[PDB]
Amino acid sequence: MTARNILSYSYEEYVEKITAFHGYPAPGVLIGGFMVDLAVKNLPEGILYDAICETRTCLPDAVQLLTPCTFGNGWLTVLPMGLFAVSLYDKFTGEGVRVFLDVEKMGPWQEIRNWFLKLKSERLFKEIREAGPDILELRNVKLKPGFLEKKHKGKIVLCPQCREAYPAQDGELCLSCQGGSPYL
Amino acid sequence: MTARNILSYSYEEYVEKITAFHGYPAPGVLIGGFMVDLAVKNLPEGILYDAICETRTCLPDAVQLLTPCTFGNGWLTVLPMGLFAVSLYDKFTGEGVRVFLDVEKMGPWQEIRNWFLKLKSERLFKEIREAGPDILELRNVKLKPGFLEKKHKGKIVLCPQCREAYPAQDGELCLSCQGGSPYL
Ligand SMILES: [Cl-]
Ligand SMILES: [Cl-]
Ligand SMILES: [Zn+2]
Ligand SMILES: [Zn+2]
């Protein structure tokens, strides 16, 4: 029954939007909402930010649903490191904020803890909403130089093997024909 | 002025949705719409499919906007191989369809060709809509075994260095502390 807006959305509006997009109101994307909300609230007002998720699970959809950063526009980067953390950072300077879960704060919340630590769901969902940002920690960060590199003006050539267009830098065949092909 | 629906959307509804999500009605996401539409139209009726994009640029947002597959639910995989191609495949069997651009078909469309090949925009946008799926080719594919693997029931441990939770398989530190950290 606790009032828990996520950016401009009510918690119920946010649950609606995320089930629509992600397919299920997954704990990770719900918690993810609180994280992105706290992160945005701790950036300077009106700035243009990029995003980094340190896990591929759930958290990217919280970012995509709530921020202008998407996987397809490149403003969201996903580093698959298995860490339930997101950073939002100034695109010009690389200064930003990282938000992650603080298990030290999940005393009052054993369902969130059992979920987070995969220890072996109506109760879980109520807890996420009650906890809100109380299970989160924030830290100022600055991105490494490589994350703010000029993107390269690549020359497009034709792969002799599959006859598709690809960046010439990738080699004498495209990366698929080199062995990256997922297909039999 | 050509009628060009993209799944359930009109071309104008689709342009609206994609500018909202992606930030700009980028040629890639527009073309991407035609691709995902042709792909879905060539899967058996009513089946549950996963998606693969072979480039990170634009094409993922066409998939995310039009299909239930998202980066965060794991039903969309992005293989960053620089190839403007998407496949949709049966999640159970791995049989699917790959769609890509056929430059052989871009005779009537020099603006699309100049864009696709990066050779050095009101005209480009009109052409994409006029061309529709005429610049696309389709091929039946079956995914390699590794893309249909059972996902591992990982044990969650605490990184001694950063004291965040991570999968024990990753090592004695988490992948960030091992060196994957994007932060200074
Ligand atoms: Cl991950
Ligand atoms: Cl790529
Ligand atoms: Zn090739
Ligand atoms: Zn660590």
Residue numbers in the entry:
A (entry chain A), B (entry chain A): 1 to 120, 127 to 190
Text of the article:
Here, the first crystal structures from PF02663 are described, representing two bacterial and one archaeal species: B8FYU2_DESHY from the anaerobic dehalogenating bacterium Desulfito­bacterium hafniense DCB-2, Q2LQ23_SYNAS from the syntrophic bacterium Syntrophus aciditrophicus SB and Q9HJ63_THEAC from the thermoacidophilic archaeon Thermoplasma acidophilum. Two of these proteins, Q9HJ63_THEAC and Q2LQ23_SYNAS, contain two domains: an N-terminal thioredoxin-like α+β core domain (NTD) consisting of a five-stranded, mixed β-sheet flanked by several α-helices and a C-terminal zinc-finger domain (CTD). The proximity of fmdE to genes encoding the catalytic subunits suggests a role in methanogenesis for proteins in PF02663. Individual proteins within this family display differences in domain architectures, metal-ion binding propensities and dimer interactions.
The final model includes one protein molecule (residues 1–190), one chloride anion, one Zn atom and 42 water molecules in the asymmetric unit. The total β-sheet, α-helical and 310-helical contents are 18, 56 and 4.9%, respectively. Q2LQ23_SYNAS displays a similar architecture to Q2HJ63_THEAC, with a larger NTD (residues 1–154) and a smaller, treble-clef zinc-finger domain CTD coupled together through a nine-residue linker (residues 155–163). The linkers in Q9HJ63_THEAC and Q2LQ23_SYNAS separate the NTD and CTD domains so that the closest edges of the two domains are ∼20 Å apart. Two significant structural differences between Q9HJ63_THEAC and Q2LQ23_SYNAS involve their metal binding. First, zinc is bound to the putative active site on the NTD of Q9HJ63_THEAC, but is absent from the NTD of Q2LQ23_SYNAS. Second, whereas the structure of the CTD of Q2LQ23_SYNAS shows four Cys side chains within coordination distance of the Zn atom, the structure of Q9HJ63_THEAC is atypical for a treble-cleft zinc finger in that three Cys side chains and an Asp side chain are within coordination distance of the zinc. In Q2LQ23_SYNAS no zinc is bound to the NTD. The chloride is bound near the end of the central β-sheet facing towards the extended stretch of polypeptide connecting the NTD and the CTD on the symmetry-related subunit. The overall fold of the zinc-finger domains of Q9HJ63_THEAC (residues 171–201) and Q2LQ23_SYNAS (residues 162–190) are similar, with an r.m.s.d. of 1.1 Å for 24 superposed Cα atoms.
